[PDB]
Amino acid sequence: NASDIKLEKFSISAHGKELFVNADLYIVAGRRYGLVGPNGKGKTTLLKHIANRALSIPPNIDVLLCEQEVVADETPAVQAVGAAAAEAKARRILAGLGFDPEMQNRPTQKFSGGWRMRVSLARALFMEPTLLMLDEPTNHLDLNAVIWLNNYLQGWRKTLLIVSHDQGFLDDVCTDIIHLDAQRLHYYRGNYMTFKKMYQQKQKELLKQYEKQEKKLKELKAGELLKRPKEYTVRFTFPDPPPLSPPVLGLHGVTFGYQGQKPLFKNLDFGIDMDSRICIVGPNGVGKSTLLLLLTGKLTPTHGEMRKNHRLKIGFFNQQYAEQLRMEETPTEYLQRGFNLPYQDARKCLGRFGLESHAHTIQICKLSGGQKARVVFAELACREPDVLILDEPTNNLDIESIDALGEAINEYKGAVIVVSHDARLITETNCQLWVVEEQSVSQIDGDFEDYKREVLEALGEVMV
Numbered sequence: 001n002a003s004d005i006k007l008e009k010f011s012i013s014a015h016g017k018e019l020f021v022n023a024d025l026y027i028v029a030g031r032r033y034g035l036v037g038p039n040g041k042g043k044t045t046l047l048k049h050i051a052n053r054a055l056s057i058p059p060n061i062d063v064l065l066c067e068q069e070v071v072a073d074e075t076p077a078v079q080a081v082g083a084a085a086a087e088a089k090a091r092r093i094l095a096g097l098g099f100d101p102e103m104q105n106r107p108t109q110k111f112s113g114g115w116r117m118r119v120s121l122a123r124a125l126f127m128e129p130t131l132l133m134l135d136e137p138t139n140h141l142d143l144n145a146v147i148w149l150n151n152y153l154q155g156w157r158k159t160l161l162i163v164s165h166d167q168g169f170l171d172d173v174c175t176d177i178i179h180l181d182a183q184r185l186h187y188y189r190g191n192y193m194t195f196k197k198m199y200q201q202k203q204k205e206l207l208k209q210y211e212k213q214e215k216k217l218k219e220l221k222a223g224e225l226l227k228r229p230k231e232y233t234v235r236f237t238f239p240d241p242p243p244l245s246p247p248v249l250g251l252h253g254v255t256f257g258y259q260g261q262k263p264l265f266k267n268l269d270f271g272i273d274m275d276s277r278i279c280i281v282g283p284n285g286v287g288k289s290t291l292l293l294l295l296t297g298k299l300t301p302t303h304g305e306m307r308k309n310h311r312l313k314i315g316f317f318n319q320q321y322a323e324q325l326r327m328e329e330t331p332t333e334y335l336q337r338g339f340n341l342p343y344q345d346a347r348k349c350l351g352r353f354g355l356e357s358h359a360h361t362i363q364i365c366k367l368s369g370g371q372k373a374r375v376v377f378a379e380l381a382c383r384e385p386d387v388l389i390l391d392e393p394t395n396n397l398d399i400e401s402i403d404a405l406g407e408a409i410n411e412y413k414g415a416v417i418v419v420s421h422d423a424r425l426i427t428e429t430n431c432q433l434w435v436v437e438e439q440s441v442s443q444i445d446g447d448f449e450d451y452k453r454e455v456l457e458a459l460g461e462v463m464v
């Protein structure tokens, strides 16, 4: 039938880096593996070397997914290549990923990059290969697409290899976890929950064995070798705001659109309290980021107005601001000059948001996207905000920092408005869901599972 992959003590060096030293690749046919590990450690390189067959791989049909070309070809046609059944399947996969009939029959040239990535995703799902490899497939999808993709991949019967830092996705889809650590692959049977249990237990026991080793060495001296394990203590805690008299923040009769385009919102009324937990949902391109920018005041309404308490302090996150910052300063200098922080305070703040010590003295322009995002979260902490407004906060974070962010949101005594595709984050923070639709915002009275069933019921899909 189908062969397994067992490549033992292979090594991969790429871009002048020793990414894999004597690693073992075990991929059993039919199982679903999630590949997790820190940024820049060689996950994408491993997938590319498997697809290339640069590593000795048996002749199984293997597909690695990447962005699809832009031409006059209609989207279901780039999927497609009896025929009625195949076209219906392609259109079902496309609708699940957020394609309405028009977008379906739309030429692939009139789509942005992310939508072309979705088109390619539909392709590899349609082809149904023996071994399908997905590189962070939910990272740039919206919540509706992630809901559908999770539900779809649970019924997948062939072999999957998925790189991801989407914890709920990994928990719902994967039967095995592969951890890229110390240039090697470590295997865990079960989803991410099982992996984190086993890994934290391994680290506790390594610490105890190191301590007993050093105690016995001291005893020998008074009368191969192990190293001390490494800590990784992220704490995303935000300071709790003092009491604030209403009104807090609201849009009143707000109409907004961009020049020469049909307005994205008409006669919009939407307000928050100091305990609000709001998750803005809707397919990409509907205006979620625009709504957040209207809530911050960085976009001015065409009609109506935004009103907030004149003492309200907003902490705002989005990826484009992370590329803004103050590029020639170090993160330490950035925090100290922005908020008159003593050096030790800036250091502890940068450290607890996940910025390693060696990066505190690098110019911000030389930092990676994840490092810049962590600097922005630290800045938000220093701003002492009353309202957190987070547009896709998890895109450049690891799972441990996303868990820390969820815990911090649950401890935070201010308001939080978030746009996110991370189901675990949206769920654990008890977010009330508000969908952008009808040039307005509509409340989903119900929990996240109600919205998930609603999304799948609109598509004629059976929730597993």
Ligand SMILES: Nc1ncnc2c1ncn2[C@@H]1O[C@H](COP(=O)(O)OP(=O)(O)OP(=O)(O)O)[C@@H](O)[C@H]1O
Residues within 6 Å of the ligand: 014, 015, 017, 019, 038, 039, 040, 041, 042, 043, 044, 045, 046, 135, 136, 163
């Ligand atoms: N085109 C390139 N040129 C130079 N260096 C690269 C290139 N691609 C990757 N690298 C380096 O190789 C290392 C591993 O890259 P890779 O992208 O495989 O890691 P990854 O973060 O696990 O992958 P991904 O984030 O794409 O899932 C990183 O240090 C990265 O900077």
Ligand SMILES: Nc1ncnc2c1ncn2[C@@H]1O[C@H](COP(=O)(O)OP(=O)(O)OP(=O)(O)O)[C@@H](O)[C@H]1O
Residues within 6 Å of the ligand: 258, 259, 264, 282, 283, 284, 285, 286, 287, 288, 289, 290, 291, 391, 419
């Ligand atoms: N500066 C701009 N000028 C003209 N049109 C814009 C501009 N910014 C966004 N748009 C358009 O407005 C529509 C909605 O944009 P927006 O990014 O707010 O929605 P979104 O995809 O839900 O948010 P996100 O960017 O967080 O995914 C899109 O069709 C987009 O092309």
